[PDB]
Amino acid sequence: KSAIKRVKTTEKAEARNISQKSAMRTAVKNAKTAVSNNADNKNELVSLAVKLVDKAAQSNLIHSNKADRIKSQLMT
Amino acid sequence: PTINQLVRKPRQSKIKKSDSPALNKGFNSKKKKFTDLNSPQARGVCTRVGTMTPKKPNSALRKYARVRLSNNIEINAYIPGIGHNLQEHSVVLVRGGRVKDLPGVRYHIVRGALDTSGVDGRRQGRSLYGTKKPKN
Amino acid sequence: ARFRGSNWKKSRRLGISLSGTGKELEKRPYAPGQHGPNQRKKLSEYGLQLREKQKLRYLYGMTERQFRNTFDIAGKKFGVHGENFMILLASRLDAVVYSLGLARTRRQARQLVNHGHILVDGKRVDIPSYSVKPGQTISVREKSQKLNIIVESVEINNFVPEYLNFDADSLTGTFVRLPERSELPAEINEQLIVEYYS
Amino acid sequence: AVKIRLTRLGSKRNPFYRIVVADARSPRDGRIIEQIGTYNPTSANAPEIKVDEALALKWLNDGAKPTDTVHNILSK
RNA sequence: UGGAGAGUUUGAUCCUGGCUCAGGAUGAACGCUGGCGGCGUGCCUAAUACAUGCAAGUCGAGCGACGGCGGACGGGUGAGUAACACGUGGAUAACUACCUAUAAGACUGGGAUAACUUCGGGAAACCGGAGCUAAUACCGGCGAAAGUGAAUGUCACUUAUAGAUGGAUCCGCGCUGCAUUAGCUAGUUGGUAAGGUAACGGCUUACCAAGGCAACGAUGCAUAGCCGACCUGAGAGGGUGAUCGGCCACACUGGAACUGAGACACGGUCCAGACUCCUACGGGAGGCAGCAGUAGGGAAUCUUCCGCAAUGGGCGAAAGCCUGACGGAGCAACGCCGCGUGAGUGAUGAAGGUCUUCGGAUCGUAAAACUCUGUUAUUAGGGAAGAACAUAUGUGUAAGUAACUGUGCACAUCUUGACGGUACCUAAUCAGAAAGCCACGGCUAACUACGUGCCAGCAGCCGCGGUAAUACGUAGGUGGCAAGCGUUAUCCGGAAUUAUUGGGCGUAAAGCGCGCGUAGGCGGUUUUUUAAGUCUGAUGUGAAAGCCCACGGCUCAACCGUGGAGGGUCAUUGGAAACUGGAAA
Ligand SMILES: [Mg+2]
Ligand SMILES: [Mg+2]
């Protein structure tokens, strides 16, 4: 039973990505609201952070690395 | 016939049927093995001591055993040899092959491995009847 | 697998007077058993290829499985399946022993092979159905001179083939060429043999 | 990539090999890609080493992991 | 290279025509007998609940006192699915823990916490609390980045490359029975929209749009894993799907997920159902179609075996470690093969059986003796080539700075065999322990004398049985095969008895009661093209392994080894225009 210790990573690895993912998407869900206003204040310098979390489809690899371009392919 | 027609319908060949009906197929499943296939052999359980005759011109007497097989169905039989240590509801091995000039009997009760175990009275034709001689 | 029983029923009931189960005869007016000039003589139209199948099967002492397994060894030869079968029966190690005059029957030729007293090329061959390939010789072991039964064969010369070099007392031979017919046999056609197998 | 492999064949009390190469994902008995020639384990009435290095250099270019007792063939 | 027949309707024929036998097979059963050296295959019937054992770990040159790679490979099974499941050739809309080839850069700055002692509750599965801590763990700037250790070298991190490897996907063709089943789907067919996964996508949703499929078999039922191959056959074909390989699906039942490189995960996981069983009746545990063994329906299929030395696989830089993959043994004539139970010498028909004028024959040189032999074994032992290495250490390859490192490119030589006091082989009291089984009218190979005497029977058909009867039990005799002989159920040949190779319709089985007629099938003559069929050339491919065509060797042989032939009704790549076919007169 050496997959007992594999379970303890599995309830532990859910927390890191689902925090990163839910912060990836609400930074992006507010972004297309900010891209619906386009005042260059609530959209600038966090859209590349919305692309840094779409670059954290390579850092936070729970979203797959080759799947980095499934959302970020339109705004920038 | 014509090669045009042979394209439109092939030669659906002649079906044949088994000479001995009451064995060897997947029968009638009822959430258990309610009935099954016995390709060469089976068990039995007896129901009746049999005494009968041939019917064509012949006038002898024959001793069958009307049973119920291990798959709910009803067949006659025959004991080859001399001895009869059989009574009603005793286990009998089976093996196929009908008996001519008897009107409806079906198989042969194997005289070797059953309650039909061994038949004395025979000394030369032996392994057709299950009789031993450990000297030779 | 071996045929035993030296009674003349192999010669008299078949008919041929070969050197098999007893070279002599003593109950010459009769066949074996009550089968005789008294009783039934059962002949057939398929008994003319039966008795060219049964004529050889006791000669080497071989079973039924041996002939069919040797009938299609001649199929590897460029002749037909009935043409080189007698040649492969003439090339076995057993009938070359009796051809070298080192034993006194074809059956005594199978006794002195399996018991190690006759070898091939030094290496211990103990197979009566061993095929003598061309370019090989015949050997013995070091204990083959004390035995009276080889010296029995030194007393009497038995049989000379044409496909060998003939040494009846030196106990070593030479297979110079593949045989032909009427060297080992003398009486059998290659046409009544093959018809039994169809 | 691929790993250089000896397919064991042979009856009771008598092994025998054939030099093949495939990934470890493939098993020993089958799904083998190529064969650069046979290999002869027993040395009595039989050779002891057999290889053909023509199509062996085709697999050391794209990567190959010979087992450390197979490498004694190609060191000779 | 290779291809048989016989019997039976009549008082007697020729023909049509059925039924029946001889032969080959079985991961068969069962019937009698039993010597094995050696080789293989042993749940096919209730998908009947599964005790007890072992099958997934490894790393102490991470780092403390869990952080990594592996459990997606591997080993079991056929209930499902008539389908890109599989077979076979074409196509790009995109997918790698790995493996590697060069090159880049491998910086900067932080803070939360298991194990551990106290804390309380439960019988338990164990949990809520609090002080303690590193990490190569975690975070910030068509954009992230790691360091570690015996002699800086080494070894993983990280980005873009492209090669191998690995999966995915639509497409042409091959893919069972029925028409006493003719209609069929509705997000069904299509555009458009944005969302949606590695990508295309009715892929899932929204307004419009009137289509999909089909008598060339659409839809629906029952039966089924499928190929390479196995069986039989002159071949063409028929029937089969087991060990052995490739692909596929499934895990007591029915859904759904999570981590990671590419699982909807057999041994993990949350939930719901029918079952086993314990608890303090508050709750929790259990999934041997892994390796075997027991239980269960059965006429039917085995040891609860030590073990990693060889080949293969994870992890580590190495010793090594777990390996029911496997290297092998324990058991059944289960199949083929090879082999013995002996031969050389040995007339007076010796004792003696049923037949007989028993005036007599048969087995029968058989037996009784005489003579050699000891494959085999009733006596123990020296004792495999199968083991090449790895590790370094003997000094060699460059980074030799550094043969310590990845290698071990002098050897790899102080080293590695449960099985195995095996394979082999010598020497002994001994021819002494080691042979059946079915048949014997005709077929069909093999005959006699009585008992019973249309009876106990026997039977593949003709049938032999009303007072013996060559065709029933018995002894004698013979024939067959032989460590094996018969019987059964099943399949192919016999059966030219579904006939393309290879039949038939006046009376024998069979010509619609007959016209007009749609699709369809076939179409005279001429010349000229086209190459669609057809012809041949070229390439690539239809992988091992089997049958066959050959050979060192296991003392031959069964099996292994090397070569050889064996697939196309295919795609594509050139020549020819004779007929069948579109096109001009
Ligand atoms: Mg396993
Ligand atoms: Mg095994």
JSON list of C-alpha atoms (C1' of nucleotides) in Angstrom, two decimals, chain E residues 80-170:
[
{"chain": "E", "resi": 80, "resn": "G", "atom": "C1'", "xyz": [-20.34, -7.15, -24.38]},
{"chain": "E", "resi": 81, "resn": "U", "atom": "C1'", "xyz": [-20.06, -4.78, -29.40]},
{"chain": "E", "resi": 82, "resn": "A", "atom": "C1'", "xyz": [-22.22, -6.95, -36.98]},
{"chain": "E", "resi": 83, "resn": "A", "atom": "C1'", "xyz": [-18.32, -2.08, -35.85]},
{"chain": "E", "resi": 84, "resn": "C", "atom": "C1'", "xyz": [-13.09, 2.00, -39.18]},
{"chain": "E", "resi": 85, "resn": "A", "atom": "C1'", "xyz": [-13.81, -3.82, -33.55]},
{"chain": "E", "resi": 86, "resn": "C", "atom": "C1'", "xyz": [-10.50, -6.02, -36.84]},
{"chain": "E", "resi": 87, "resn": "G", "atom": "C1'", "xyz": [-7.86, -6.57, -41.90]},
{"chain": "E", "resi": 88, "resn": "U", "atom": "C1'", "xyz": [-5.75, -3.82, -45.79]},
{"chain": "E", "resi": 89, "resn": "G", "atom": "C1'", "xyz": [-3.75, 0.00, -48.48]},
{"chain": "E", "resi": 90, "resn": "G", "atom": "C1'", "xyz": [-4.19, 6.27, -48.81]},
{"chain": "E", "resi": 91, "resn": "A", "atom": "C1'", "xyz": [-4.30, 11.36, -45.67]},
{"chain": "E", "resi": 92, "resn": "U", "atom": "C1'", "xyz": [-2.49, 15.96, -41.82]},
{"chain": "E", "resi": 93, "resn": "A", "atom": "C1'", "xyz": [-6.61, 19.99, -38.91]},
{"chain": "E", "resi": 94, "resn": "A", "atom": "C1'", "xyz": [-2.38, 19.16, -33.97]},
{"chain": "E", "resi": 95, "resn": "C", "atom": "C1'", "xyz": [-0.10, 15.73, -29.35]},
{"chain": "E", "resi": 96, "resn": "U", "atom": "C1'", "xyz": [6.34, 13.00, -26.18]},
{"chain": "E", "resi": 97, "resn": "A", "atom": "C1'", "xyz": [8.07, 10.61, -17.97]},
{"chain": "E", "resi": 98, "resn": "C", "atom": "C1'", "xyz": [11.26, 9.27, -21.85]},
{"chain": "E", "resi": 99, "resn": "C", "atom": "C1'", "xyz": [15.65, 9.05, -25.64]},
{"chain": "E", "resi": 100, "resn": "U", "atom": "C1'", "xyz": [19.04, 12.16, -27.58]},
{"chain": "E", "resi": 101, "resn": "A", "atom": "C1'", "xyz": [22.89, 16.41, -31.52]},
{"chain": "E", "resi": 102, "resn": "U", "atom": "C1'", "xyz": [24.74, 21.45, -31.15]},
{"chain": "E", "resi": 103, "resn": "A", "atom": "C1'", "xyz": [23.82, 26.20, -28.71]},
{"chain": "E", "resi": 104, "resn": "A", "atom": "C1'", "xyz": [21.64, 29.70, -24.97]},
{"chain": "E", "resi": 105, "resn": "G", "atom": "C1'", "xyz": [20.88, 30.81, -19.92]},
{"chain": "E", "resi": 106, "resn": "A", "atom": "C1'", "xyz": [21.30, 27.88, -15.55]},
{"chain": "E", "resi": 107, "resn": "C", "atom": "C1'", "xyz": [20.15, 34.84, -11.81]},
{"chain": "E", "resi": 108, "resn": "U", "atom": "C1'", "xyz": [17.42, 37.53, -8.26]},
{"chain": "E", "resi": 109, "resn": "G", "atom": "C1'", "xyz": [14.27, 38.02, -3.57]},
{"chain": "E", "resi": 110, "resn": "G", "atom": "C1'", "xyz": [10.94, 35.84, 0.23]},
{"chain": "E", "resi": 111, "resn": "G", "atom": "C1'", "xyz": [7.95, 33.54, 3.75]},
{"chain": "E", "resi": 112, "resn": "A", "atom": "C1'", "xyz": [3.81, 28.74, 5.36]},
{"chain": "E", "resi": 113, "resn": "U", "atom": "C1'", "xyz": [4.63, 23.75, 7.29]},
{"chain": "E", "resi": 114, "resn": "A", "atom": "C1'", "xyz": [4.46, 16.76, 8.16]},
{"chain": "E", "resi": 115, "resn": "A", "atom": "C1'", "xyz": [7.55, 13.15, 11.23]},
{"chain": "E", "resi": 116, "resn": "C", "atom": "C1'", "xyz": [8.45, 14.94, 16.10]},
{"chain": "E", "resi": 117, "resn": "U", "atom": "C1'", "xyz": [6.57, 16.23, 22.72]},
{"chain": "E", "resi": 118, "resn": "U", "atom": "C1'", "xyz": [2.36, 18.18, 25.16]},
{"chain": "E", "resi": 119, "resn": "C", "atom": "C1'", "xyz": [-3.56, 18.84, 24.06]},
{"chain": "E", "resi": 120, "resn": "G", "atom": "C1'", "xyz": [-8.60, 16.43, 24.43]},
{"chain": "E", "resi": 121, "resn": "G", "atom": "C1'", "xyz": [-12.72, 12.59, 22.08]},
{"chain": "E", "resi": 122, "resn": "G", "atom": "C1'", "xyz": [-13.62, 7.62, 20.14]},
{"chain": "E", "resi": 123, "resn": "A", "atom": "C1'", "xyz": [-13.34, 0.22, 21.18]},
{"chain": "E", "resi": 124, "resn": "A", "atom": "C1'", "xyz": [-12.13, 1.31, 16.41]},
{"chain": "E", "resi": 125, "resn": "A", "atom": "C1'", "xyz": [-11.23, 4.47, 10.71]},
{"chain": "E", "resi": 126, "resn": "C", "atom": "C1'", "xyz": [-8.20, 7.90, 14.27]},
{"chain": "E", "resi": 127, "resn": "C", "atom": "C1'", "xyz": [-8.90, 13.01, 14.60]},
{"chain": "E", "resi": 128, "resn": "G", "atom": "C1'", "xyz": [-9.71, 18.73, 16.38]},
{"chain": "E", "resi": 129, "resn": "G", "atom": "C1'", "xyz": [-5.52, 21.95, 19.04]},
{"chain": "E", "resi": 130, "resn": "A", "atom": "C1'", "xyz": [-0.52, 23.79, 19.84]},
{"chain": "E", "resi": 131, "resn": "G", "atom": "C1'", "xyz": [4.51, 25.16, 20.34]},
{"chain": "E", "resi": 132, "resn": "C", "atom": "C1'", "xyz": [9.54, 23.01, 16.38]},
{"chain": "E", "resi": 133, "resn": "U", "atom": "C1'", "xyz": [11.87, 22.65, 11.37]},
{"chain": "E", "resi": 134, "resn": "A", "atom": "C1'", "xyz": [14.51, 22.23, 6.74]},
{"chain": "E", "resi": 135, "resn": "A", "atom": "C1'", "xyz": [13.51, 20.71, 1.22]},
{"chain": "E", "resi": 136, "resn": "U", "atom": "C1'", "xyz": [16.15, 19.85, -5.62]},
{"chain": "E", "resi": 137, "resn": "A", "atom": "C1'", "xyz": [9.02, 21.12, -1.81]},
{"chain": "E", "resi": 138, "resn": "C", "atom": "C1'", "xyz": [6.35, 26.85, -2.24]},
{"chain": "E", "resi": 139, "resn": "C", "atom": "C1'", "xyz": [5.96, 31.92, -4.08]},
{"chain": "E", "resi": 140, "resn": "G", "atom": "C1'", "xyz": [7.29, 37.58, -6.11]},
{"chain": "E", "resi": 141, "resn": "G", "atom": "C1'", "xyz": [9.82, 40.59, -10.07]},
{"chain": "E", "resi": 142, "resn": "C", "atom": "C1'", "xyz": [-3.59, 25.41, -46.06]},
{"chain": "E", "resi": 143, "resn": "G", "atom": "C1'", "xyz": [7.98, 34.14, -20.18]},
{"chain": "E", "resi": 144, "resn": "A", "atom": "C1'", "xyz": [10.16, 29.96, -16.38]},
{"chain": "E", "resi": 145, "resn": "A", "atom": "C1'", "xyz": [14.90, 28.16, -14.55]},
{"chain": "E", "resi": 146, "resn": "A", "atom": "C1'", "xyz": [18.22, 23.12, -8.51]},
{"chain": "E", "resi": 147, "resn": "G", "atom": "C1'", "xyz": [21.27, 21.87, -6.71]},
{"chain": "E", "resi": 148, "resn": "U", "atom": "C1'", "xyz": [23.66, 17.50, -5.03]},
{"chain": "E", "resi": 149, "resn": "G", "atom": "C1'", "xyz": [28.46, 13.96, -3.75]},
{"chain": "E", "resi": 150, "resn": "A", "atom": "C1'", "xyz": [32.98, 9.33, -3.07]},
{"chain": "E", "resi": 151, "resn": "A", "atom": "C1'", "xyz": [37.94, 10.68, -7.59]},
{"chain": "E", "resi": 152, "resn": "U", "atom": "C1'", "xyz": [36.21, 21.60, -10.03]},
{"chain": "E", "resi": 153, "resn": "G", "atom": "C1'", "xyz": [34.91, 16.57, -13.73]},
{"chain": "E", "resi": 154, "resn": "U", "atom": "C1'", "xyz": [30.20, 14.40, -13.17]},
{"chain": "E", "resi": 155, "resn": "C", "atom": "C1'", "xyz": [24.52, 14.64, -12.71]},
{"chain": "E", "resi": 156, "resn": "A", "atom": "C1'", "xyz": [19.30, 16.27, -12.93]},
{"chain": "E", "resi": 157, "resn": "C", "atom": "C1'", "xyz": [16.82, 21.79, -13.76]},
{"chain": "E", "resi": 158, "resn": "U", "atom": "C1'", "xyz": [15.17, 25.40, -18.25]},
{"chain": "E", "resi": 159, "resn": "U", "atom": "C1'", "xyz": [13.80, 27.43, -23.44]},
{"chain": "E", "resi": 160, "resn": "A", "atom": "C1'", "xyz": [13.50, 27.13, -28.74]},
{"chain": "E", "resi": 161, "resn": "U", "atom": "C1'", "xyz": [14.67, 23.32, -31.90]},
{"chain": "E", "resi": 162, "resn": "A", "atom": "C1'", "xyz": [14.17, 18.48, -35.04]},
{"chain": "E", "resi": 163, "resn": "G", "atom": "C1'", "xyz": [15.12, 13.16, -35.22]},
{"chain": "E", "resi": 164, "resn": "A", "atom": "C1'", "xyz": [13.51, 8.49, -33.24]},
{"chain": "E", "resi": 165, "resn": "U", "atom": "C1'", "xyz": [9.56, 6.70, -30.03]},
{"chain": "E", "resi": 166, "resn": "G", "atom": "C1'", "xyz": [4.02, 6.90, -28.70]},
{"chain": "E", "resi": 167, "resn": "G", "atom": "C1'", "xyz": [-1.04, 7.75, -29.28]},
{"chain": "E", "resi": 168, "resn": "A", "atom": "C1'", "xyz": [-5.19, 10.18, -31.98]},
{"chain": "E", "resi": 169, "resn": "U", "atom": "C1'", "xyz": [-8.32, 10.74, -36.48]},
{"chain": "E", "resi": 170, "resn": "C", "atom": "C1'", "xyz": [-11.81, 11.30, -40.57]}
]
